[PDB]
Paper text:
Dichelobacter nodosus is a Gram negative, anaerobic rod that is the principal causative agent of ovine footrot, a debilitating disease of the hoof of ruminants. In strains that cause virulent footrot these proteases are called acidic protease isoenzymes 2 and 5 from virulent strains (AprV2 and AprV5) and basic protease from virulent strains (BprV). All of these proteases are synthesised as inactive precursors with an N-terminal pre-pro-region, a serine protease domain and a C-terminal domain of unknown function. AprV2 adopts a subtilisin-like fold consisting of a curved six-stranded parallel beta sheet sandwiched between two and five alpha helices.
Sequence analysis of the aprV2 and aprB2 genes has shown there is only one amino acid difference (Y92R) between the two mature proteases. To investigate how the single amino acid difference (Y92R) between the active forms of AprV2 and AprB2 alters the substrate specificity of AprB2 we determined the crystal structures of AprV2 and AprB2 to 2.0 Å and 1.7 Å, respectively. The two structures were very similar (RMSD of 0.28 Å for 339 Cα) and therefore we will describe the structure with reference to AprV2. Surprisingly, the single amino acid difference between AprV2 and AprB2 (Y92R) is located at the tip of this extended loop, ∼27 Å from the active site serine (S277). Purified AprB2, which differs in sequence from AprV2 only at residue 92, is less efficient at degrading elastin. Under these conditions, the ability of AprB2 to degrade the substrate was significantly less than AprV2 (p<0.05). Both proteases displayed similar activity against the soluble chromogenic elastase substrate, N-Methoxysuccinyl-Ala-Ala-Pro-Val p-nitroanilide (AAPVn), with kinetic parameters that were of the same order of magnitude. Instead, the reduced elastinolytic activity of AprB2 is likely to arise from impaired enzyme-substrate interactions at a site distal to the active site. To our surprise, complementation of the aprV2 mutant with aprB2 also restored a virulent phenotype, indicating that AprV2-mediated elastase activity was not required for virulence. Importantly, the hoof digestion pattern produced by AprB2 was similar to that produced by AprV2, which is consistent with results of the virulence trials.
Author numbering: 2 to 341
Write the structure that this text describes.
């Protein structure tokens, strides 16, 4: 087990309905040399992230969303997506009036590869991997076109005006989405990333609805992740249905954030719930699998990697109320599969 101060609270890594990441670490696989891209709100300069974070890129085109004074730029720092006075619409709905900064991209990034065995804070599923933050979300979310350009760059695609990605990712985590069908542009970029070799791992969404009514789940060539609880059943908010590929822990997920309600104040750790939290468990396990496959000289296409993940899942706790993919992602079974 790692020495991290709050590892024991990360039930989702090691306990009954967790992802069995600990069993893979025991085999000596940690996602070594694998790059995972995180298309999200950007990254904090958090002491429990910095060593496992590579420089990424900020794809937010509108400065009113980016809150950093300009359009696309080389610094994917999460400025904080806080707002007040219904800046993101919906006035006068009391639930939409204001929000603290989410630090969503950092919570997600920490699940994949928080710095581990460094005494402080938490652990990451693939703590030998490196994360490339692709900032596409800010105040009020992000543009579909910024998300799709970012995911393409994440895979190794060239975007005019932006440097070539030196560290294209084998796994692209997208803990994001909204109502509606996959756009032509989103589908096209997902297909291009898939043809580069990247597995695009996406959140099923959080409206207790059919995930097929949302994107990116409704896209071809994605692996859609539903959310389960520490009791092994469907989290109440999790989207569901035939297009959910599998599930992962998505309620009371402890990871890396900032204590600041607006701007960054201090490195912190919080519990969050969402398919956004389940997704990076699957992205992390994918990176563990690739490190294992690398060791035996085995290539996995995105379709093959998805099939490894989906066919090796562990069972739910009795009957669920909805289709939620094949079971809970299981790193031990997935890695054992590719090692032969
Ligand atoms: Ca900017
Ligand atoms: Ca920036
Ligand atoms: Ca740590």
């Amino acid at each position: 087990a790692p020495n991290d101060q709050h590892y024991r609270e990360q039930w989702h890594y090691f306990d009954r309905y967790g992802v069995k990441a600990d069993k893979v670490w025991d085999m000596g696989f940690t996602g070594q040399n694998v790059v995972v891209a995180v298309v999200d709100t950007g990254i904090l300069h958090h002491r429990d992230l910095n060593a496992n974070v590579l420089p990424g890129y900020d794809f937010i085109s509108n400065s009113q969303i980016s809150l950093d004074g300009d359009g696309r730029d080389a610094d994917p720092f999460d400025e904080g997506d806080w707002f007040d006075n219904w800046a993101c619409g919906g006035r006068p709905d009391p639930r939409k009036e204001r929000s603290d900064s989410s630090w969503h991209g950092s919570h997600v990034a920490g699940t994949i590869a928080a710095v581990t065995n460094n005494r402080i804070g938490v652990a990451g599923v693939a703590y030998g991997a490196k994360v490339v933050p692709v900032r596409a979300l800010g105040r009020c979310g992000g543009y579909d076109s910024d998300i799709s350009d970012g995911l393409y760059w994440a895979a190794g695609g060239r975007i005019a005006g932006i440097p070539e990605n030196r560290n294209p990712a084998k796994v692209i985590n997208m803990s994001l989405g909204s109502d509606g069908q996959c756009s032509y542009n989103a589908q096209t970029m997902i297909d291009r990333a898939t043809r580069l070799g990247a597995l695009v791992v996406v959140a099923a969404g959080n409206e207790n609805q059919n995930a097929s009514n949302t994107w990116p789940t409704s896209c071809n060539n994605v692996l859609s992740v539903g959310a389960t609880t520490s009791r092994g059943i469907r989290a109440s908010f999790s989207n569901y249905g035939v297009d959910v590929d599998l599930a992962a822990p998505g309620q009371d997920i402890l990871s890396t954030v900032d204590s600041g309600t607006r701007r960054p104040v201090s490195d912190a750790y919080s519990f969050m719930a969402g398919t956004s939290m389940a997704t990076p468990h699957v992205s992390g396990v994918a990176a563990l699998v690739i490190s294992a496959a690398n060791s035996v000289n085995k290539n996995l296409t995105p379709a093959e990697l998805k099939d490894v993940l989906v066919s090796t899942t562990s069972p739910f706790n009795g009957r669920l109320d909805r289709a939620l993919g094949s079971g809970i992602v299981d790193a031990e079974a997935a890695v054992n599969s590719v090692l032969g």
